[PDB]
Subunit: 337 residues, 4 copies
């Protein structure tokens, strides 16, 4: 299928080339090719899109990104640097590339202003944030975004009417735990097995962020970070246990999934799991995505192009859902192969 859209697609800053290529060696083989790909915006990356039937991708700053930076002043500047960087690097190809805002999430009103700056001036499609914001004098605390003081940020998000993509971040736990994770081949991307996004997304639900922002759109990767697998358990926990003891979120977990959540196929090229999510989530709330360059175009689009599912859902998931959700340009698919 031609004209696909992907939106968990990462880039890094050229001035970090050496930091970046170091981390690439601890992730996958061929770190030279992956480091070059995650720095490239307009050459191989678009070549890959042409060869694999992808009309358009939305780019995001690679994790941990700004959410790893605990000094507020330094985090804000990096967000501005990154946003100005990527807006400029993609300007010539509006039919192939959009960008999500990178943000400092230290202060609710600083974050809302920077989203407004770059959405208004650059036409960014939303925000991609790598879970909680590291904070504290030496980064030992974290900032959650579901408290009442974040209402001002979510109202900016719905006012701009752009979605918010909640991407994983390497968990910051014990010394013993990180060393065990590294020695056990279980740490890092694309797996992100230790991720806290699924818990944090349930927090936004239980703390009413979607009751106060019923039009808010949050996007989850990895086909929903296993939440659809626990839909029954989560429903049971709300309706039968927690709501009876005081939990006041107005709707059911399935109603929030119908109004406020989206899942992408980032790094999850599973026909069986996708078909399972047709039941638990539905084709109308599922977005194709690759997680390039941690995943390669070929694995993602070979899989998706070959999906033996009904035509309407295959188009909705492959491109027509994102085309509307991210207000893609009409005739964007006339610039491919």
């Amino acid at each position: 299928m031609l004209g696909k859209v992907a939106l968990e697609e990462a880039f890094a800053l050229p001035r970090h080339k050496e930091r970046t290529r170091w981390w690439a060696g601890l992730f996958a083989i061929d770190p030279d090719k992956h480091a070059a790909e995650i720095n490239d915006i307009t050459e191989q990356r678009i070549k890959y899109m042409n060869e694999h039937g992808v009309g358009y991708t939305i780019l995001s700053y690679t994790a941990p990104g700004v959410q790893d930076v605990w000094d507020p002043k330094e985090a804000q500047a990096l967000a501005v640097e990154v946003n100005d960087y990527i807006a400029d690097a993609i300007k010539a190809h509006p039919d192939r590339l959009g960008a999500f805002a990178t943000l400092s999430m230290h202060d609710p009103k600083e974050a809302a202003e920077e989203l407004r700056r770059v959405v208004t001036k650059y036409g960014f499609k939303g925000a991609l944030v790598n879970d909680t914001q590291r904070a504290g004098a030496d980064g030992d605390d974290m900032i959650f975004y579901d408290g009442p003081e974040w209402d001002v940020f979510w109202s900016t998000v719905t006012d701009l009417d752009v979605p918010f993509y909640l991407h994983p971040r390497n968990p910051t736990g014990s010394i013993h735990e990180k060393l065990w994770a590294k020695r056990s081949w279980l740490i890092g991307p694309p797996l992100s097995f230790a991720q806290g996004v699924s818990l944090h997304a349930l927090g936004m639900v239980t703390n009413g962020v979607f009751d106060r922002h019923p039009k808010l759109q949050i996007v989850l990767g990895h086909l929903g970070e296993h939440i659809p697998f626990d839909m029954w358990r989560i429903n049971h926990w709300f309706e039968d246990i927690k709501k009876p003891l005081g939990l006041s979120c107005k709707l059911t977990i399935r109603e929030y999934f119908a109004r406020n959540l989206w899942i992408t196929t980032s790094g999850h090229f599973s026909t069986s799991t996708l078909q399972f999510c047709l039941g638990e989530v539905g084709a109308d709330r599922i977005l194709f995505s690759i997680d390039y360059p941690f995943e390669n175009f070929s694995d993602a689009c070979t899989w998706y192009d070959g999906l033996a599912i009904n035509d309407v859902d295959k188009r909705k998931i492959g491109k027509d859902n994102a085309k509307k959700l991210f207000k893609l340009p009409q005739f964007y698919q006339s610039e491919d192969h």
Copy 2:
């Protein structure tokens, strides 16, 4: 869920009660209750709708219905009687009851005329025809509607822009004698029903009805009369072998399911089969239905109300798809 729409819902003529009750002895454990309920239009029927969250039912004449009458003049008269009867019986409840045309399918242009008549004058939502039309001196020939001589009928169908519901009919005469009579517990829902419809629907597909009438909307009950089970197999054999050897229908089987066919959950309350069809067919083209009174409201609506599937699709298959397909006003229910 409230406001569900069901549209494979049967009624019979009161003057036919005697034989209506006989026939039921074979398909209902309590044929007296079946005849009372299949004869009733506005009392037990809508009370069942009120207690089981069904806002709207589109009613259709019970099978075999007109397709059992092989004399053309007698068949045509029954269709007219049935159509005028039902338009009048449901007139006091336009927010709860709708009707499909009943038709004699002996003559393509007679059928088109009576379809246009009743859609225009009574506002019927489409046609419900019970598979092939019995014909011949002793009613042992069969009329399929996939031949070119039916083009004039389909053009009226697409001209009105109403769907056509392709309903099973019991097997009869020689076909009945050769295959079913010696294993007749398979007659009806068990196997014979879906064997007939799928033959007929796939005939329309492979003989180009949907190519000549691309706006035609055909609805199949019982989650598609087996066809989705073999979507992969049919597609593979159409696309990789039969089309290379002469099959000339223009689209893939999957594309017809995306633009010309609809499936309902009539008499098939199977969560796992429904979930399988979420993939093979898609939620946008599945409609709730019951098959009342062969099935009862409580089995169908208890099953449906309880589906632990995503709410968007639950809303679509339970009512929204039918509201759009048949253009129903926006009622909400008690």
Copy 3:
């Protein structure tokens, strides 16, 4: 995965040049390659097995085969000639090739003796029959095997304790003339093949073949010839309606599928439909198969080898289930 077993694999008699080229022209875009593949037993066939991870295939006579032959003597002659031919032809590779008996089904005891003769002297794994036996002087009759008069045959099958593979057949005679000739692109894999097997197999259920012969194992190809799609629907109508009204088979349809029935993946390389059958049927009763040469090895085994399913079932469906059912010895890559 290595060591796969496939068991709906056809071969033809080399003397039947017309019949082979004719059937091949309706089922392949390259009928010349199909005729060579369906005639070869030991060269191309074993090359494909080596290249695609298939340790063992059980061979069967191509359809329609003996079930197309309405002269009882001529059909018995053909069946005996086929069984003697394939026993010699696979003799050099008993670690890679097995065979099902080909039988004339005009007489239960005649068939019973031929199955006993070839299972006992040649080591046949069971019988594969192409649906109903064409009978009558003008070949318009069809013989089903679900009546009690076949008990003497089904008891031979259970005494030998080998399965019976019920393969489709093209529709013939009046049925073919009335239903299929005018939509004849539905003949074979698209619809007609599963309509006849399902009718017949559900006949064995409803007419008590599995009640009288409870140890009998019947194998259906093509993931069950539509039947699993209707497990729920068939179950509901048997248990709630037809049984109270007289159907007397003693188990549920699910129990027959648990105790007596098997489905294969022949010609149905559909991940989604397989996933559905894992629930409705269970991996313990699902066997890999290809339908070679109508299907090619590469399509069947790229699909199977690439299935992202749990390893226990992948091994059971791919070789372990067949290794137990057909009592296979330690064969190539087993």
Copy 4:
């Protein structure tokens, strides 16, 4: 279906306060072994349940002598408490997992003296001055324990445990209503179970049987991602474990239906895991019998898998009457 087997069923020491809706039924039910528990087993078609000590239990006790003592206390107590009903009640060993050779000894003792069905351990063992450390069991020093486990040929049930504290993280979780069981959403079992694979526990102990609750703590949902991680990224980078994740799930792991009564998810797991490795379980008393067994009795799935998951798999795995 009658004769069902459930094996994630918890009990507490009577000597040990209010946590759920109508909490009185929960405290009485989790202390009861032979009265409340067996009457429900009769009412809902459950022939046999294997009992286990409530989380976090011993894994929360970081003092080695105090942990060993409670474990021996708990084992000796439940073995006597269920003595009268051995055709209905079974038990998993409670263990201090501070010392592999000491844990192996206590597992051996109670399997040998009391006929326990295996071990149930609540994820990692709290350890170190003040309990700021945890013990993992996948290193070579635990081979002596796993060989004891495989020699006794009993399964090992890896149960969740209250996650690592962080003050803000604990407060945020407990104001956000996402804290505690039966959800235990921040479980570490998924990560640790996968560790046993990547650190070679199943390579060094090919016969070890590990059981996971909550239908596998989402590992089945991520089976494609984990397989792809092993075979296409980590193995080519240097990971040396000998089999694929699916092969380990086929040979060494089990999932139960504890606290996860979802027909659609179960059917999802027939594909990802398979009926031969799924065991019914309830999570009593955190879950109640009627929700668990009303769900299971009503499953419209093929007959063989229903009897395998309901009792037949547990009867063979646990070598039951």
